[PDB]
Write a protein that binds this ligand. Structure first.
Ligand code: NA
Ligand code: NA
Ligand code: NA
Ligand code: NA
Length: 199
RNA sequence: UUUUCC
């Protein structure tokens, strides 16, 4: 419908280079069904519009509720990349309709890493590591609540630093002990709570 | 080496 369109669309950032609108649609339609989020027969995603030069897509869904549920996919890995799923900036919650997803997608780690006591900074990462591989490095210590690898906005190349938050606050110091000061060729990892060196 | 339209 006309009034609900703003509540039926999502921004998806950090998309794989060269991805087609059809490949993106198939990915989300399958994940929605496999995750138990699809609320009827047929495809929940109606269309995808990609901006190739700017590296983002907008999904359009058939229903308000399926759009909300799909927010739970924020951080899902697609061709090595953490998809950044967000509301359009002009989105306004409707009356009687929920704002936040009610389901959890197993193994999907949010990209939203708020400043907090145990948010970690990881600097000095080799730039050839993609989001998936950096996430795996950190997951070795324990499950993550949130993670983002910082990329150049124009080229898509990793800038070699990331932020994360472990589910268990006590894993923070274990990751620091295991990674801080690790030498990788010309780089030396700096792993510390992000508050220590933030601007 | 402190997360990017209609
Ligand atoms: Na990117
Ligand atoms: Na389930
Ligand atoms: Na970009
Ligand atoms: Na930039």
């Amino acid at each position: 419908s006309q009034m609900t369109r703003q509540a039926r669309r999502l921004y998806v950032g950090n998309i794989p280079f060269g991805i087609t609108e059809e490949a993106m649609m198939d990915f989300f339609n399958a994940q929605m069904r496999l995750g138990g989020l699809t609320q009827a027969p047929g495809n929940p995603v109606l269309a995808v519009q990609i901006n190739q030069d700017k590296n983002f897509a907008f999904l359009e869904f058939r229903s308000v509720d399926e759009t909300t549920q799909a927010m739970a996919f924020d951080g899902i890995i697609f061709q090595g990349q953490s998809l950044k799923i967000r509301r359009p900036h002009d989105y306004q919650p409707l009356p009687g309709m929920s704002e936040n997803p009610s389901v959890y997608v197993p193994g999907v780690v949010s990209t939203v890493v708020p400043d907090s006591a145990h948010k970690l900074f990881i600097g000095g990462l080799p730039n050839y590591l993609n989001d998936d591989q950096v996430k795996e490095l950190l997951t070795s210590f324990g499950p993550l609540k949130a993670f983002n690898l910082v990329k150049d906005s124009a080229t898509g190349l990793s800038k070699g630093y990331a932020f994360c938050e472990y589910v268990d606050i006590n894993v923070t110091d274990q990751a620091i002990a295991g990674l801080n000061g690790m030498q990788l060729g010309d780089k030396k990892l700096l792993v510390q709570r992000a508050s220590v060196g933030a601007k």
